[PDB]
Amino acid sequence: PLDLALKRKYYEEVRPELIRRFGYQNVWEVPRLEKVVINQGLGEAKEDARILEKAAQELALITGQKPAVTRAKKSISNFKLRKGMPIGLRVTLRRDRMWIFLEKLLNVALPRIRDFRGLNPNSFDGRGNYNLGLREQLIFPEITYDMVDALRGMDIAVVTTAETDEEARALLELLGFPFRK
Amino acid sequence: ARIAGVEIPRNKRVDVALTYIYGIGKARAKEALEKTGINPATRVKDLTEAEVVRLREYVENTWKLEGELRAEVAANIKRLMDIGCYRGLRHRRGLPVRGQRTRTNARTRKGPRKTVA
Amino acid sequence: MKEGIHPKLVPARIICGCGNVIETYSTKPEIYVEVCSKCHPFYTGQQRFVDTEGRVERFQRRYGDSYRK
RNA sequence: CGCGGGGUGGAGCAGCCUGGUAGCUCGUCGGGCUCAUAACCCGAAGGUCGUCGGUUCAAAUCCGGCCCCCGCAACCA
RNA sequence: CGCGGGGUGGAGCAGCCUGGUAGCUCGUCGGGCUCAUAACCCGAAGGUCGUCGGUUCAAAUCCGGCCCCCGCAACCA
RNA sequence: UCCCCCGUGCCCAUAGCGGCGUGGAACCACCCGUUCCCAUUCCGAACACGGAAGUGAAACGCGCCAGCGCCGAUGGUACUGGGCGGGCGACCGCCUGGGAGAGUAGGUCGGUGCGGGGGA
RNA sequence: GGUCGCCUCCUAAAAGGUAACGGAGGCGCCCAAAGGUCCCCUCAGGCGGGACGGAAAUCCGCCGGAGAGCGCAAGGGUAGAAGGGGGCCUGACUGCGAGGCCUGCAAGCCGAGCAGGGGCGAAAGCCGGGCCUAGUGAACCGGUGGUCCCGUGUGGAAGG
RNA sequence: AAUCGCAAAAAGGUGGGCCCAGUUCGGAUUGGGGUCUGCAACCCGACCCCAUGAAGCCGGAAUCGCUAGUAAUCGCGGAUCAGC
């Protein structure tokens, strides 16, 4: 709905340096970010933690959306889990909550991670787009020591029109992402 | 979460709360009271909201800490392996590398007394 | 939008860095930092920190070449 | 082969019925007392449970094939 | 199904015909003693007194009975 | 009546998998937005709605190839209803009628009926 | 010794049916949601992808027609749902039943449609329990609740 | 060498600071960086600086010394010896 600092960043700076490399013969063939699916993917909320909520409202006040409880695919023995047990926290940041979130990761949250050292670049899938994992949560700007209780890393997935892995590299690299080498 | 790798203790002194970082002691804490002139020892929260920030900077780029210093002390010993030295072979074993006495004690190198028949 | 349950994030000033209030509408009214997108090893600069070229290893200890060929 | 019961730390026994649940005794290794050994006092160590499939979310436990311990039979008029 | 009684600390039970105390040995910790495993001994954590709804001035001893174990009885086309 | 298009029926993959192309004035789609109706175990993704700036990239459409899948004969045979003889047997032979499965040659990148909206 | 009723499959010779102390398995339950409807949705698996996190917890990607699932045995069927989720619900109706399936009898089984009165749906329509095929017991004797039909001259009652 | 030297005796007195926490208790362990001896410091020393900041919240069964300036608790000192 809105207009923000990375949304225009992707606008007049990124679209050209992309037609730079691959020289797209059409307005749309050019990459662009669609979905952003954050995944705390608990399982720490087994047959116990009803307090999975005070860890997922934190997920709300850092993503802006309520996260939807993903349950069990089936029942699992050594994992201590029954088909139906809550074990996931999926929030799909789509459209203009994506840019509002993605910039706040890159400019403020990404650097505040302890001993930052690039981004693992092989972790690109190939057939399409990209995603890679965390370690914590309070590194995110919205919180600190007393507000955050238990520690909880989280997964984060990009879904772009990057048909090819190479052109994905460029899209994110230019968009503000620091890589390992 | 605070400074500079992880959050130093609020409600704690601005001479004491120093050593807690992976890289500082009461020895190096004198940079505070003497190389930026900081409070005698009045608390971390107690500090002036701009004096708080002036301390953030002057010890990050002045020394080495946390993840680098952990690795600095760590990656250094990998060298000792790749040559095959008496200090890098006894670390390769996890035994008192700094050469002492390994009959009685030598526990901290060894873990709990394993005990055997 | 589902009406209610989502935190009403109004445009909030992210007062970070050394001269950048990285504005974008966060649900947290104001923010701070001590390590940011500004000052950073991989964000710009060589970043020697205070770690030079591997402490001193090994011929940088000087007091060498006692022998004169 | 016919039925019946059994197989679990080294020895001997619980545990199965009602699945997720491994205990009792001895002994064994470590330590104490003692001149010393036992006694006794202080600690710990030790079984994927016959064997295989398999049911279930998952098997000492439920199920079936085979190996084995033991108990009655295989009536020969 | 119908008559008999309670379902009390973790494991047993006296409180109880006549309500007043949020009950005693075993078990368990610490303690004096023991050479010890022991009896003795001083202090202790344990009741939502099966629950629910009552009778009052509160109930665990008085009720409607939920409950579902022990007990007896009789019937089973 | 010929053609393209949209909405659709029908034969049952010769239709399909894939790669190669081309189609936007039309019509279809993506696309614009969240105000309204409506809407998400989160998200206007989807369903919804108000639109018409962009486009034919995606999807879909018409087409091209035969790598895949698919369909696939003729000939002969196995088998067999019926009628005979043959071997100790396990089984074998002849007559008459019927006659496959595989495999071979080859075919296939669809074929159409109803209405509507364009072209002449 | 084993067996005895029921269901699945095979034997069973391409209709139905068919024996043997033939070969293999299950049933004597379950579900106020696992049911009715309306809306909506789509598997197993494999490869790459990713903090804890795994051969397999959850999130992302491309390939998948059905090998998943459908309470539990097996066969048939089945995603153009019969399977997964949500809203309202209670047709897991009362009175019937044209016509058949099976069949020695008796039982078993399918059901359009009509009437009352409701459920969901905008409506067309769908609901007389569950993807079907097991989850069972004739008659006698009695219990309980109703109805108020008989009630030993007669009004009741007893009994039925 | 009752000259001068090792020599500030430490517990103590006095001011301050902590604030019931594996902590300012605790100093094990370790990485690089230095001084001193002695040819010499890998095995192998001792001191020094940075940093690291471990077991330990008082000890199972058992067990030891000591009856008065003694137990307990403090520092100093020689001999061995280049150093330790």
Ligand SMILES: CN(CC[C@H](N)CC(=O)N[C@H]1C=C[C@H](n2ccc(N)nc2=O)O[C@@H]1C(=O)O)C(=N)N
């Ligand atoms: C030992 N007896 C004999 C009973 C008879 N009247 C006589 C006799 O010999 N009967 C026997 C006849 C054969 C019978 N038998 C044996 C084997 C077999 N396979 N089938 C049989 O019938 O078993 C009988 C048996 O011994 O009791 C008695 N105590 N009565």
Ligand SMILES: [Mg+2]
């Ligand atoms: Mg190009």
Ligand SMILES: [Mg+2]
């Ligand atoms: Mg790193």
Ligand SMILES: [Mg+2]
């Ligand atoms: Mg050097």
Ligand SMILES: [Mg+2]
């Ligand atoms: Mg047996």
Ligand SMILES: [Mg+2]
């Ligand atoms: Mg044995």
Ligand SMILES: [Mg+2]
């Ligand atoms: Mg026993």
Ligand SMILES: [Mg+2]
């Ligand atoms: Mg068994």
Ligand SMILES: [Mg+2]
């Ligand atoms: Mg067990």
Ligand SMILES: [Mg+2]
């Ligand atoms: Mg004792």
Ligand SMILES: [Mg+2]
């Ligand atoms: Mg067995």
Ligand SMILES: [Mg+2]
């Ligand atoms: Mg015999």
Ligand SMILES: [Mg+2]
């Ligand atoms: Mg009694």
Ligand SMILES: [Mg+2]
């Ligand atoms: Mg009274």
Ligand SMILES: [Mg+2]
């Ligand atoms: Mg003694």
Ligand SMILES: [Mg+2]
């Ligand atoms: Mg009797």
